[PDB]
Amino acid sequence: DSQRSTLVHWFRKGLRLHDNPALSHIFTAANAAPGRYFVRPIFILDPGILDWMQVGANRWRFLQQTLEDLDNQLRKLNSRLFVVRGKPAEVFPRIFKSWRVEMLTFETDIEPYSVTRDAAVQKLAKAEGVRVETHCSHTIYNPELVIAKNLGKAPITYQKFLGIVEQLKVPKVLGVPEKLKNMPTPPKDEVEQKDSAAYDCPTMKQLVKRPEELGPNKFPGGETEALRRMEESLKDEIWVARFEKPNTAPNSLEPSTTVLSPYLKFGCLSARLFNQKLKEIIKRQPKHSQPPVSLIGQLMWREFYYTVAAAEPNFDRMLGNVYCMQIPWQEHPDHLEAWTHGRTGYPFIDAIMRQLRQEGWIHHLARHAVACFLTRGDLWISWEEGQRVFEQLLLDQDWALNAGNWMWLSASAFFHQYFRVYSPVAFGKKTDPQGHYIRKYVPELSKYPAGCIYEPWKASLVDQRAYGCVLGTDYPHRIVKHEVVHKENIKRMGAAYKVNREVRTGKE
DNA sequence: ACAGCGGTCGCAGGT
DNA sequence: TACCTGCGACCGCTG
Numbered sequence: 099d100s101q102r103s104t105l106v107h108w109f110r111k112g113l114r115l116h117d118n119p120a121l122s123h124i125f126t127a128a129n130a131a132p133g134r135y136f137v138r139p140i141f142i143l144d145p146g147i148l149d150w151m152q153v154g155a156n157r158w159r160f161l162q163q164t165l166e167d168l169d170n171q172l173r174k175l176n177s178r179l180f181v182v183r184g185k186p187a188e189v190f191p192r193i194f195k196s197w198r199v200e201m202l203t204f205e206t207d208i209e210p211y212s213v214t215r216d217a218a219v220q221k222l223a224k225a226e227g228v229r230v231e232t233h234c235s236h237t238i239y240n241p242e243l244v245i246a247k248n249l250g251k252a253p254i255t256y257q258k259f260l261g262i263v264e265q266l267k268v269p270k271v272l273g274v275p276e277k278l279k280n281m282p283t284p285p286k287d288e289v290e291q292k293d294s295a296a297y298d299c300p301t302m303k304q305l306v307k308r309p310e311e312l313g314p315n316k317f318p319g320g321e322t323e324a325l326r327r328m329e330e331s332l333k334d335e336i337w338v339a340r341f342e343k344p345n346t347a348p349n350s351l352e353p354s355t356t357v358l359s360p361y362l363k364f365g366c367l368s369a370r371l372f373n374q375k376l377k378e379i380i381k382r383q384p385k386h387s388q389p390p391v392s393l394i395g396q397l398m399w400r401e402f403y404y405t406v407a408a409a410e411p412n413f414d415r416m417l418g419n420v421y422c423m424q425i426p427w428q429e430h431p432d433h434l435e436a437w438t439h440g441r442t443g444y445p446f447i448d449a450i451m452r453q454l455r456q457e458g459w460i461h462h463l464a465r466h467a468v469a470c471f472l473t474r475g476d477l478w479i480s481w482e483e484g485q486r487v488f489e490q491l492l493l494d495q496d497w498a499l500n501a502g503n504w505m506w507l508s509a510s511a512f513f514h515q516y517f518r519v520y521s522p523v524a525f526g527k528k529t530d531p532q533g534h535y536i537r538k539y540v541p542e543l544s545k546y547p548a549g550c551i552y553e554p555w556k557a558s559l560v561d562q563r564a565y566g567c568v569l570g571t572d573y574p575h576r577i578v579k580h581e582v583v584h585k586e587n588i589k590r591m592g593a594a595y596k597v598n599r600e601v602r603t604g605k606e
Numbered sequence: 607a608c609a610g611c612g613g614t615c616g617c618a619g620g621t
Numbered sequence: 622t623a624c625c626t627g628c629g630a631c632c633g634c635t636g
């Protein structure tokens with residue numbers, strides 16, 4: 099066994115055992131030749147990034163929990179997880195040599211950083227004689243294949259995208275890999291010999307530098323929770339079958355949607371498995387919704403954005419971004435700060451920004467409200483600033499999804515009906531007329547009657563005192579006047595669209 | 607050509 | 622309940 103070669107699976111996304119072709123392939127190969135190989139399933143953790151402010155504490159905790167679950171599940175297959183601290187550039191040269199790696203597998207990703215990181219790894223592997231097998235299992239459809247089927251271009255409308263993907267085959271969804279047979283623990287490398295726990299899963303203390311930023315642990319990380327949560331969602335087949343996104347509440351105290359996004363983002367849940375389960379249900383339920391508003395339709399939106407994103411490295415910026423309207427957003431530092439911390443003076447907006455910071459998830463339409471307010475609706479601040487804040491706070495932060503939906507909300511791409519503007523006062527009332535959600539997340543306003551809790555500036559000073567919260571003292575004065583600025587911004591939007599039109603027809 | 611259709615998720619005021 | 626209309630006058634696709 100001093101002569102064994104090592105098979106490595108590199109986890110980045112795809113933090114699950116189920117439906118993981120890259121992982122299954124390694125386990126299958128090991129069991130094929132019994133005394134031949136050692137198996138190392140690894141996650142590479144750069145210990146310097148633990149302070150990167152672009153990752154908030156709630157998301158670190160989710161990753162910590164996820165790695166622990168992944169180690170637990172691997173232990174059942176007579177394996178374990180190896181969390182190797184460092185950067186791939188230095189880690190791979192060392193372990194290819196140390197472990198005598200024969201093969202390396204991972205799930206592909208389309209993000210710019212990942213494309214260049216993986217090309218580097220492929221380059222090293224090729225030069226060092228390591229075979230590399232990659233798999234597209236993060237999405238149901240391979241963006242490269244969609245773009246190729248569409249003659250070299252990513253489809254820019256959803257219905258056209260659907261028309262392409264129904265021409266594509268959907269791969270088989272796999273189970274969990276097989277238990278390893280006759281597999282002693284690998285020999286310690288030089289790092290392990292110095293410290294036996296060198297590759298153990300990180301503790302909370304090691305991942306979470308700022309525990310004071312942690313909120314209630316409403317969505318625990320890992321594949322186990324992912325499947326449990328999915329199964330609980332799929333249980334009411336009528337709800338599943340009749341689901342229409344636009345009719346779900348943004349302010350219900352309990353989520354009106356699945357809340358599978360963080361699990362889909364990390365790959366704790368396979369999108370292909372979830373797609374498969376939904377199809378089985380739709381087949382059973384004669385009365386059901388269809389894309390774009392159906393539950394399957396939502397998975398297809400995820401697929402849609404991954405595809406437009408895969409063709410555009412600047413997807414997360416305005417400048418140099420092929421899809422994006424060039425719009426003269428403004429710098430408004432004080433306003434940005436107030437929006438970021440849920441101190442705009444609009445209680446609905448503030449409640450949402452507060453839930454997001456505290457819990458790491460807010461409903462899609464709650465994201466609409468704050469994203470509209472920040473950009474074209476009210477503050478006239480760049481969607482890129484909003485994206486930055488969401489990136490920090492969201493458990494489900496997803497490069498492609500965040501960028502795509504921020505462009506949609508700001509009417510920069512995909513959505514163009516800018517005359518439709520969410521009211522920070524009116525929008526939430528439809529689903530929460532008593533303002534329970536505001537009372538919860540903005541407790542200072544909790545005694546305000548429903549008749550002015552969405553618009554506290556309507557309360558006289560004697561009323562404010564009776565409610566125990568005086569504006570400008572206990573809660574902020576509204577930063578801008580929606581009824582004025584949104585009308586001026588609609589005009590700004592039309593003006594920018596016109597400039598973009600000229601430029602287009604001008605390139606001809 | 608260039609107008610007409612459809613477009614995941616607007617508001618306010620109708621009935 | 623769950624539509625309907627005016628507001629002003631978007632885009633991408635289609636033929």
Ligand SMILES: Cc1cc2nc3c(=O)[nH]c(=O)nc-3n(C[C@H](O)[C@H](O)[C@H](O)COP(=O)(O)OP(=O)(O)OC[C@H]3O[C@@H](n4cnc5c(N)ncnc54)[C@H](O)[C@@H]3O)c2cc1C
Nearest residue numbers: 355356357358359396397400462465494495496499500503
């Ligand atoms: C400004 C803005 C920023 C966003 N940033 C992210 C993000 O960083 N990461 C992320 O996962 N979602 C993002 N979303 C999309 C959407 O709001 C979330 O995916 C959804 O709220 C997740 O909740 P759920 O799992 O209950 O969704 P469900 O309605 O139960 O849908 C199931 C799954 O379908 C996918 N899905 C649903 N809606 C969308 C959508 N609009 N776009 C793409 N996929 C979707 C998600 O994977 C979701 O988990 C953003 C939306 C907006 C408006």
